[PDB]
Design an enzyme around this catalytic site. Structure first.
Site, short mmCIF file in Angstrom:
data_model
loop_
_atom_site.label_atom_id
_atom_site.label_comp_id
_atom_site.label_asym_id
_atom_site.label_seq_id
_atom_site.Cartn_x
_atom_site.Cartn_y
_atom_site.Cartn_z
N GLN A 147 -10.96 -1.50 3.72
CA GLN A 147 -10.58 -3.08 4.88
C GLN A 147 -10.50 -2.84 5.80
OE1 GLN A 147 -9.09 -2.65 1.28
NE2 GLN A 147 -11.00 -3.50 0.62
N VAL A 187 -5.44 11.03 11.38
CA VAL A 187 -6.14 11.76 12.72
C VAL A 187 -5.69 10.68 14.25
CG1 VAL A 187 -6.68 13.30 11.02
CG2 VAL A 187 -8.03 11.31 12.06
N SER A 211 -1.34 -10.62 -7.23
CA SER A 211 -0.60 -9.15 -7.57
C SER A 211 -0.59 -7.94 -8.29
CB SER A 211 0.45 -8.92 -6.26
OG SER A 211 1.00 -10.11 -7.04
N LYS A 266 -12.44 2.68 12.62
CA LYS A 266 -10.40 2.61 13.23
C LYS A 266 -11.11 2.51 15.11
CE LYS A 266 -8.06 4.65 9.30
NZ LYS A 266 -7.31 4.82 9.35
N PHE A 309 -2.76 5.86 11.68
CA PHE A 309 -1.88 6.48 10.46
C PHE A 309 -1.88 7.92 10.15
CE2 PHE A 309 1.35 3.65 12.14
CZ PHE A 309 1.15 1.87 10.99
N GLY A 364 0.91 -1.46 -0.32
CA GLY A 364 -0.34 0.29 -0.13
C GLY A 364 0.89 0.82 0.00
N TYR A 365 0.13 2.37 -0.21
CA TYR A 365 0.90 4.06 -0.08
C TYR A 365 1.36 4.01 1.24
CZ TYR A 365 2.59 8.56 -0.67
OH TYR A 365 2.74 9.88 -0.90
#
Length: 310
Positions: A83, A110, A38, A128, A108, A13-14
Site C-alpha cells: 500500500q 532503512v 477487519s 517510499k 520506519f 499492522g505489525y
C-alpha cells in the site's frame, strides 16, 4: 487538553499497533482508521478499551478522509509495502484539509534517501521516496523516521528461539553490523518525535549505542543466555543475490531485505548528517530497551514470530 490529536493509518499492522498503544500511553487523543472488513476485531476492541476512537472506512473514501483530517493535528501512516503508493490518498486528504501540523509517512525502516538495495527491495523503497518527494513539494510539515531493524521480529527470524534445532543460519559472513530496536519503543519514540519541534521537517534515526550488533555477536550472546551452542550454517552473498534474480515476487523481497540489512549492513553503513536527529539523545526520561534486555525478554517471556506482507 493541549495534547495533539493523532490519526493513525495501518494501526492494526505489525508496527502500527505499537504506535497506537504508544499514542494512548502518552495521553494523546488517538484516532484509528481501519477497514470495515477487519480480521483484527480483537485488536480493535483492545484499542477501544484503551481510549482509541475507531474509524471504519476505506482509503478510497476521499470525503471521509478530508473531514477526518480536519479534526486532528498529526497523521502517522504505518501501511504495508503493498500500500505504499496508496498513501497518496492520505496525502491528498491532508492537502485539502490544510490543518495538519505533522505527517509521518510509512518509512520506519532503512533510510531510503541514503542507501540503495537490490532491485526487489529497491523498487519498494523508491516508492517510499516518491511519497517523501510529494510531501516536500507540497511543503507539508513532516518527520521521516528510520527505525532500523524491528528487534522482536528479527530476533525471532535470526535466532528462531522457539526452535530446538542445533544449527543456526547465518546470512553472508555474518560480520555486517545492524541496529535493532524493540517494537514497543519504536512506537513510543515515534509518537514523541511527531510532536517534538526538534524533529520538525527532519530525518529522525533510531540508533541507540546499546543496540548495534552483528549476526555472529547476537548468536554468541544468545548462546551464553541459554547455555547452548549452535552449528553455524552460512548462506553465501552471491547465493542470496542470485535468488533475488530467479525467485518470483514477493518471494525474492525478503531475500533482498536480508541482504540489505545483514550483508550490506545498510542500517550502519553511514555516518550522521548535520541535520540528522538520533532519537535516543532526545529524552532523558526514556531509553531504548537494550539488546541484553531484549534477550532477557526472549528467555523469560518471548513474543510470537511475525512475517511482513509483500
Amino acid at each position: 487538553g493541549m495534547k495533539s490529536k493523532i490519526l493513525i493509518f495501518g494501526g492494526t499492522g505489525y508496527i502500527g499497533n505499537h504506535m497506537v498503544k504508544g499514542s494512548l500511553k502518552l495521553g494523546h487523543p488517538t484516532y484509528v482508521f481501519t477497514r470495515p472488513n477487519s480480521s483484527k476485531t480483537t485488536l480493535l476492541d483492545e484499542f477501544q478499551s484503551l481510549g482509541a476512537i475507531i474509524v471504519k472506512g476505506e482509503l478510497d473514501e476521499h470525503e471521509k478522509l478530508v473531514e477526518l483530517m480536519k479534526k486532528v493535528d498529526v497523521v502517522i501512516s504505518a501501511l504495508a509495502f503493498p500500500q505504499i503508493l496508496d498513501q497518496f490518498k492520505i496525502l491528498e486528504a491532508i492537502k485539502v484539509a490544510g490543518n495538519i501540523k505533522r505527517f509521518l509517512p510509512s518509512d520506519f525502516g532503512v533510510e531510503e534517501d541514503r542507501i540503495n538495495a537490490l532491485p526487489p527491495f529497491e523498487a519498494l523503497i523508491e516508492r517510499k521516496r516518491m511519497i517523501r518527494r510529494a510531501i516536500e513539494e507540497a511543503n507539508i510539515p513532516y518527520t521521516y523516521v528510520s527505525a532500523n531493524c524491528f528487534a522482536s521480529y528479527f530476533i525471532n527470524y535470526l535466532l528462531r528461539p522457539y526452535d530446538p534445532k542445533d544449527e543456526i543460519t547465518v546470512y553472508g559472513t555474518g560480520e555486517a553490523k545492524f541496529a535493532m530496536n524493540y517494537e514497543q519503543d519504536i512506537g513510543l519514540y515515534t509518537i514523541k518525535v511527531a510532536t517534538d519541534p526538534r524533529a520538525l521537517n527532519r530525518v529522525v534515526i533510531y540508533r541507540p549505542s546499546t543496540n548495534i550488533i552483528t549476526q555472529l555477536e547476537l548468536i554468541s550472546r544468545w548462546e551464553k543466555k541459554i547455555g547452548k551452542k549452535f552449528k553455524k550454517i552460512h548462506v553465501p552473498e552471491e547465493e542470496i543475490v542470485a535468488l533475488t534474480k530467479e525467485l518470483p515476487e514477493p518471494e525474492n523481497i525478503p531475500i533482498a531485505i536480508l541482504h540489505c540489512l545483514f550483508i550490506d549492513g545498510a542500517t550502519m553503513s553511514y555516518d550522521f548528517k548535520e541535520n540528522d536527529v538520533e532519537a535516543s539523545t532526545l529524552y532523558p526520561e526514556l531509553k531504548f530497551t537494550t539488546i541484553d534486555e531484549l534477550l532477557d525478554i526472549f528467555v523469560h517471556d518471548p513474543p510470537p514470530p511475525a512475517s511482513a506482507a509483500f
